[PDB]
Amino acid sequence: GMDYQEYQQFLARINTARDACVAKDIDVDLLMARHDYFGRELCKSLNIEYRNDVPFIDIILDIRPEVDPLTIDAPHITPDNYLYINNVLYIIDYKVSVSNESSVITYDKYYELTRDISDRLSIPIEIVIIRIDPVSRDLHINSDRFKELYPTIVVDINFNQFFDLKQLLYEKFGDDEEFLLKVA
C-alpha cells in the first residue's frame, strides 16, 4: 500500500475536514493517489522506469533526437508512460476502475491524436491502456501486441487502505447532501 506517511496525511485531512468542498478534494486526491500507487507497482512488474504524465513532444525527442521540437507537428497529450521496442512506440496509460468507460475515452483520444504523427515518423504507435479492477484485482490490457512482449504480468497489490479511507470519508459526510452530490 501507500506509505504510512501518505495514509496519515489522508487520515489527518479527513478528520480536520468540516466542509463538502474539502471532502470532495480528498475523494479526488484518493483516486489520484490510488492511480499513481498502481502506476509505480505496475512499472516494477513491467521492469520499466516509472513515469507520470510525460509530454508527447519529449517521447518523440527521446526515440528520434534529430527531430526539431519547435517545428514537429505533434499532439498535446501527456500519457502516464511509454515503451519503444523493435521500432514500435507503445503509449501506456494507468487506469484503476471497475468499468472501461474512462479507458475508452483515453484510448479514443490517444488513438485519434497519434494517427498523423505515426504516419509522419513512419513508426507504428500502439495505444496501451493497462487497467486494474480494484475489486477483483484482475489486469485488463487492450493491446494484443503489448501482451506478446509481456505474456504474463502479475502486479499482486490491493487498495484496502484506499477503500477504508474513502469509506471513512463517506461515513463522516454521509448526511452532507452537498458532498454526496458534488463531482470532481
The annotation places the binding site for Mn(2+) at 35, 53, 80, 93-94
Residue type, 34: R
Backbone angles phi, psi at 94, to 5 degrees: -80, 140
User: Angle, to 10 degrees, between the axis of helix 4-16 and the axis of helix 160-172?
Assistant: 10
The residue whose grid cell reads 523493435 is: 86
Q: In this structure, how many other beta carbons lie within 10 angstroms of the beta carbon of residue 169?
A: 20
3-state secondary structure at position 94: strand
Interface residue with ligand 0N8 among 53, 62, 108, 119 (CB under 6 A) is 53
93 binds Mn ion (CB under 5 A): yes
77 binds ligand 0N8 (CB under 6 A): yes
Contact window for ligand 0N8 (CB under 6 A) among 6-14, 27-35, 135-143, 157-165:
27-35
Question: In this complex, which beta carbon is closest to ligand 0N8, that of residue 21 or of residue 87?
Answer: 21
3-state secondary structure at position 146: helix
Q: Which positions touch ligand 0N8 (CB under 6 A)? A: 31-32, 35, 53, 76-78, 80, 93-95, 102
Q: Which positions touch Mn ion (CB under 5 A)? A: 53, 80, 93-94
